[PDB]
């Protein structure tokens with residue numbers, strides 16, 4: 001079942017990527033960069049999850065699905081880039097703020113991998129550092145990055161706020177599931193965690209970009 | 222023999238690098254970025270192949286020359302950057318298209334490495350995904366990237382087209398040799414593959430940049 | 444003792460990061476990019492050294508202990524330090540990102556050769572070490588040659604500050620391959636504990652000290 005779920009995931013990622021490609025051909029004032037980011041996220045995630053489907057992207061240690069970290073270390077910084085460029089749409093870019101989010105995010109995913117390879121107090125030190133990185137990402141998202149969105153007018157700021165809440169709601173689920181599941185306290189069963197880390201990312205990767213791109217395209221007319 | 226061939230390769234990479242450095246000192250209207258890229262490619266490849274020469278960049282699994290993938294994951298994106306900047310010479314840059322090629326290319330090399338670590342059907346799934354990435358790179362090369370080159374005038378577009386054909390002809394040999402050799406069907410012997418992955422990259426890395434830089438330098442007024 | 448020294452280091456990195464964050468809030472004409480670089484360096488190093496303190500960022504190999512977390516640190520922190528140095532030289536003028544990325548490429552290569560040298564035995568070890576030393580020499584040639592000429596093109600006051608920071612960095616950086624060669628990774632003349640203290644104290648000056656001096660000099664160029 002776990003294999004088939006991962007094949008299904010990879011197929012949905014492929015369909016999302018093709019959809020973003022088709023949108024890219026009639027862009028409606030959205031720059032090519034935002035379509036490229038929207039395509040890379042699902043294609044990379046699809047490849048990583050394909051490796052799990054084939055029985056390759058995991059080892060016994062508990063089962064570490066290390067292919068999830070290979071996925072997230074690329075897909076999650078690109079999602080924050082997508083979010084930052086939404087805030088900056090129609091105005092001057094702040095690439096310093098964007099790379100701040102990328103750095104916090106890459107650190108966050110690495111702490112998750114290290115936490116998974118750790119035992120006891122050490123595991124929760126790494127987990128805690130990752131949670132602190134996420135909190136700072138959310139502070140940037142609803143603080144300075146939202147103020148950039150407000151500077152780009154009512155309609156953009158409304159769209160940004162919707163996508164920021166969408167992303168934030170989904171992202172806080174990941175460390176929650178991780179702590180509850182086999183990598184953490186072991187309250188939730190492996191199969192439950194597998195379904196959560198199939199369904200969440202479908203919304204985090206394809207859903208997010210459908211909402212993000214549709215809202216930006218609508219600003220054209 | 223395999224060790225000595227890799228020492229030879231690394232020496233040729235060093236000579237290429239020094240040649241590009243000397244050209245960089247009298248640049249003839251070619252930006253410093255294109256000289257930097259031309260130098261990094263052979264120096265990085267030379268270091269990776271030095272590790273094989275020293276008996277370090279390989280393990281038994283059949284022999285996986287993993288240092289080739291360490292080489293290509295850096296050298297091949299830089300070659301496509303060189304190709305993209307050639308198309309954009311004298312005009313506005315399209316870094317979105319450039320990073321599209323980089324992303325496709327890094328994926329391509331990773332699928333190769335995973336294919337090498339895989340057995341049976343799994344191996345050919347990864348190989349096929351890599352080949353699909355290469356096809357998209359070639360579609361971009363002869364489609365949108367070539368239209369950028371045409372927008373920069375007859376002489377630039379003529380040079381771009383020659384370099385694009387040069388690169389494309391060499392690059393399709395890599396997945397061909399891979400499939401024929403020990404990582405794939407195992408029709409070609411290890412030593413045969415070693416010579417192919419010595420001679421191809423000499424043309425792919427030093428040859429390519431000699432041709433690319435010479436054509437760009439020739440566009441120079443005064 | 445080794446564990447406690449690493450906890451201490453990580454705490455000092457955290458304090459440096461906080462100081463640079465506070466400076467960033469009253470920037471005095473220094474772009475946000477230079478404050479971000481100044482913060483990432485110590486935070487990343489602090490994380491890497493935290494892993495050593497927890498007993499994780501090290502393994503036994505050739506009977507010696509390889510502190511592999513040091514290379515994970517340096518491969519990110521050292522290119523960012525040269526970026527900080529290059530942006531100092533370019534302060535008030537046109538950026539040369541080609542020269543900046545030249546330093547980044549040399550530097551990443553340098554750290555990788557160090558790691559490979561540490562995993563190597565005999566002549567092979569010293570081939571890798573030598574390639575890293577050649578990379579450092581070229582970095583220092585760029586630092587005092589073309590990069591210094593960019594700094595001089597940005598006027599007396601900037602060039603004076605650049606030269607001070609270039610000497611500061613260069614003096615500290617030549618110590619790393621010197622300690623490496625003397626210590627357990629090289630000739631084994633210096634003891635593990637001695638090397639540990641050197642690779643605690645040097646980086647405190649290389650990462651926090653450097654950026655205090657660098658940022659203070661740039662901030663002082665500001666009028667208000």
Ligand SMILES: CCCCCCCC/C=C/CCCCCCCC(=O)OC[C@H](O)CO
Nearest residue numbers: 474475476477518519522523526530547551
């Ligand atoms: C194993 C492989 C590891 C790979 C290692 C990766 C190295 C990470 C650092 C990169 C250099 C950072 C470069 C900084 C970019 C230039 C900044 C710039 O342009 O600044 C503009 C201005 O200052 C704003 O106002």
Ligand SMILES: CCCCCCCC/C=C/CCCCCCCC(=O)O
Nearest residue numbers: 254294295298299302314316323327
């Ligand atoms: C593990 C794989 C990591 C791959 C990293 C990528 C390798 C480095 C190549 C980057 C592409 C270079 C792009 C240069 C842009 C030049 C644009 C300009 O000159 O304005």
Ligand SMILES: CCCCCCCC/C=C/CCCCCCCC(=O)O
Nearest residue numbers: 254261295538539540541544548551
């Ligand atoms: C592992 C070693 C390789 C690491 C990356 C090396 C980067 C090589 C390519 C960089 C090209 C950057 C050129 C930027 C051009 C901008 C124009 C300028 O200001 O000079």
Ligand code: NA
Nearest residue numbers: 082083085086
């Ligand atoms: Na966006």
Ligand code: NA
Nearest residue numbers: 303304306307
């Ligand atoms: Na070129």
Ligand code: NA
Nearest residue numbers: 527528530531
């Ligand atoms: Na600086």
